[PDB]
Symmetry: none
Subunit: 242 residues, 2 copies
């Protein structure tokens, strides 16, 4: 049964019409009719049974049935600060991170991110990433949709007041996952760009009480370095081991 | 600033060309050039700033700018079932109804509608009415465009499964707007033809659990009877009082 996100708060026995991307996916790509099985959610951590009543071109109209809490969220809070990159790697990172239960995401600027975006082009990028978050939530069964926060400068993100651990990875780190002081329930995870963080930036994260960690003795691919780290955290402090 | 409907989904910073009726209205009737102020929408309940880049004969090409949600929709769902009539009254009814925030419209056949339309002539009529819906939306500032549903037989429309109230007007009705059980969030409103619904048709709407209502002690003109009823509903359960 297909999972659909609904950008407006859902209620038990209403009729509704799907947002445009949902109607396109269901009726225009999937050519489904009534046709009835759909499962819907809206970010409330609830999930609704629903029936395709009617369907058309541009248009798909359904009715929603019984609703219920279905919590696929990890009890660990992981806030990923991912330094932006010009390619198509940010998109894959968002998608996969969400599948691994990442709680919240802030795209970052740093000295070597190589991204130089105008206000509007960055707003557009952020909307697209929010759509990626939504689609990945449909796929992996999450019923909360993590926010893609507005982009931030590196240091400003580092400076944010927030309880919990602040981690960054470094091949010369003074800790590993297993030597981190317990318990761990909130983590801000900083992932830098391919060109890396500069010595000034490193020094600055230290001023902000970041703990840097080793992630094994092998060299990790940039592309996937976030995923690996998130997976480790989820396994050790989150639900991947439960 | 002129409001334009665009029959294709809109996006923030694209260039586009207006559909034919829009290009005719803007460049051929309004003789506008660049010339830049236009506001555009596409039924998503969003509205876009836009610039007439170029304009020609048959041709008007523009670029779209920032987009934003601008919700002029009533929170009350009113589905008008309006029995068809041969004159030019259906057109005025569609236009004005839309201006008053009617959610959805189904043109109906009944015993005394006096309309006997061939498939193709009825398809054509429905397209024209959909254009009226669009134009009225441009005018009144609505950013959703209500669907003119395919015409239906009276009883088949009555039989449709749909949560909410089902109303019809009768000078010997057993309720008024104010005696209707609360709350009211969805209404199907049946408006009959000038020759009226027959006793068999009345009896049949009762079988379908229609509630008939009085609409004041004066005799209402056929032409406008829909408008009056919609206005009342919008005032009492919708946004005309807010």
């Amino acid at each position: 049964i297909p999972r659909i996100y609904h950008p407006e708060p859902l209620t038990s026995h209403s009729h509704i019409a799907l947002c445009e991307d949902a109607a396109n996916h269901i009726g225009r790509v999937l050519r489904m009719g009534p046709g009835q099985a759909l499962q819907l959610f809206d970010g409330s951590n609830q999930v609704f049974d629903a029936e395709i009543t009617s369907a058309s071109k541009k248009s798909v109209e359904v009715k929603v049935l019984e609703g219920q809490i279905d919590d696929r969220e990890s009890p660990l809070h992981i806030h990923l600060g991912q330094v932006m990159s010009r390619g198509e790697k940010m998109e894959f990172t968002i998608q996969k991170s969400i599948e691994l239960g990442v709680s919240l995401i802030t795209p970052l600027f740093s000295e070597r991110c190589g991204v130089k975006l105008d206000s509007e082009r960055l707003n557009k990028k952020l909307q697209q990433w929010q759509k990626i978050a939504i689609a990945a939530c449909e796929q992996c069964g999450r019923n909360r949709v993590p926010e893609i926060r507005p982009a931030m400068d590196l240091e400003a993100w580092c400076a944010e007041q927030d309880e919990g651990l602040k981690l960054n990875l470094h091949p010369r780190a003074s800790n590993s996952i297993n030597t981190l002081p317990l318990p761990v329930e909130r983590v801000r995870l900083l992932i830098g760009p391919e060109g890396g963080l500069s010595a000034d930036e490193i020094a600055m994260t230290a001023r902000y009480q970041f703990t840097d960690i080793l992630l094994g003795p092998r060299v990790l691919r940039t592309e996937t370095t976030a995923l690996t780290a998130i997976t480790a955290l989820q396994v050790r402090f989150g639900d991947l081991g439960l």
